[PDB]
Amino acid sequence: STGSATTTPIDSLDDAYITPVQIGTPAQTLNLDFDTGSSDLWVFSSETTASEVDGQTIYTPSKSTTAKLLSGATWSISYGDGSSSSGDVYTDTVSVGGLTVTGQAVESAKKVSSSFTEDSTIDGLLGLAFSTLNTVSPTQQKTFFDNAKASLDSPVFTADLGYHAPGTYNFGFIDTTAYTGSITYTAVSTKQGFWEWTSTGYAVGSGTFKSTSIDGIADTGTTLLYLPATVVSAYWAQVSGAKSSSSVGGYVFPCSATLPSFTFGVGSARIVIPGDYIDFGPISTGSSSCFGGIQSSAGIGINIFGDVALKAAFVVFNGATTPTLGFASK
Known part of the structure; x- marks a missing residue:
């Protein structure tokens, strides 16, 4: 299998890039920041403290027929820029650019730090570093790439980011x-x-x-x-x-x-x-x-x-x- 999705700068400075991701059944499309420096796929959600949501699209697991609470699992992450988020975990179907993973850990935010709230364009992160960094406890979870890998035509993904322009993330082919x-x-x-x-x-x-x-x-x-x-x-x-x-x-x-x-x-x-x-x-x-x-x-x-x-x-x-x-x- 392969996937191919367009990634788009969030603003005129290319401060970050967002890529649409389909979560659940029927699909809920969220715009995620693909992050090769972390290993958690987390989203703004119906569980996120209301005062900490300001314009983001949320994932609502109760509206997904394929969502399942991962019982007992929690997550908490702190990033190098001082930002952070935490919550609980569901498994659900996640698709990127036509590439589908079933049973992907989708980490639902209960809390996010101010910089996340203040950025209306980023609905969450999709980590693409190695799964050893994943923060889910007590059972560490795999990244979207790690879960897809065996099904891919080739065990690779590529980043082709644009300057003041859209670009592409491909999975499974060069x-x-x-x-x-x-x-x-x-x-x-x-x-x-x-x-x-x-x-x-x-x-x-x-x-x-x-x-x-x-x-x-x-x-x-x-x-x-x-x-x-x-x-x-x-x-x-x-x-x-x-x-x-x-x-x-x-x-x-x-x-x-x-x-x-x-x-x-x-x-x-x-x-x-x-x-x-x-x-x-x-x-x-x-x-x-x-x-x-x-x-x-x-x-x-x-x-x-x-x-x-x-x-x-x-x-x-x-x-x-x-x-x-x-x-x-x-």
């Missing part, structure tokens, strides 16, 4: 028309539950490539590119007037700037992030100070190849017995 050149594959460590890999280095604009190992994760659920302070300083040093602002919470730059590109290494291959991808706009409405899309990972504890990096590539998440990651230009 669309050879969706990228240019060849796909370069690189090793993955699953030890921390993430799609963790090692970039072979970087360049800033038309500068020389620096060969250096940068361990990090491919995370579709993080917006920006978070790298070591040395690398980030080297980038922003090429932008007149750019500076790190503790009050704002990262590097800012004059909105009048033309940003240089940023290249990262995948083995002997190179992925080029155009400068425009690194512009996240005014820090507040009407400001001439703009927020940068490359930020320091210092204090996060891990480097994160978030959407800013991934959207410059066609990315293969290869879930074969020994997982790997593939990157191609597009």
Whole structure:
């Protein structure tokens, strides 16, 4: 089997991407944030504290003839941006782009933190990291990908995120028309539950490539590119007037700037992030100070190849017995 679904930026800055997901019988379609940095599929629901719902579409298990309470199961998750959610669990039929899993754990939120409430466009998350990170207790549950894997034509999914435009998540096949050149594959460590890999280095604009190992994760659920302070300083040093602002919470730059590109290494291959991808706009409405899309990972504890990096590539998440990651230009 295969599936193919379009993923759409939530706003003009590509702050995140939403993909329609069918849950239950008859189908309830929710727009979920596909997140290769976590492993819970959770939704706003009829059980979510009413004051914490503000415009989201909710899953109502009582209206689904295939929903079953997973008795005794609870979940609770805290993310790297300080947000969180928790609740109980149902199993139900879940379909993405024509690909169906029966008995998928659908984690129903009873509580969500303010940033989730405040974002009306995201109805929940669909985790695509390794199932070892799943938070359901006392019986850990599998991700949608893990459940689908054996049925897929090939045990893979691909992320093809757009810049200011829709893109595609495919399950079970590699669309050879969706990228240019060849796909370069690189090793993955699953030890921390993430799609963790090692970039072979970087360049800033038309500068020389620096060969250096940068361990990090491919995370579709993080917006920006978070790298070591040395690398980030080297980038922003090429932008007149750019500076790190503790009050704002990262590097800012004059909105009048033309940003240089940023290249990262995948083995002997190179992925080029155009400068425009690194512009996240005014820090507040009407400001001439703009927020940068490359930020320091210092204090996060891990480097994160978030959407800013991934959207410059066609990315293969290869879930074969020994997982790997593939990157191609597009």
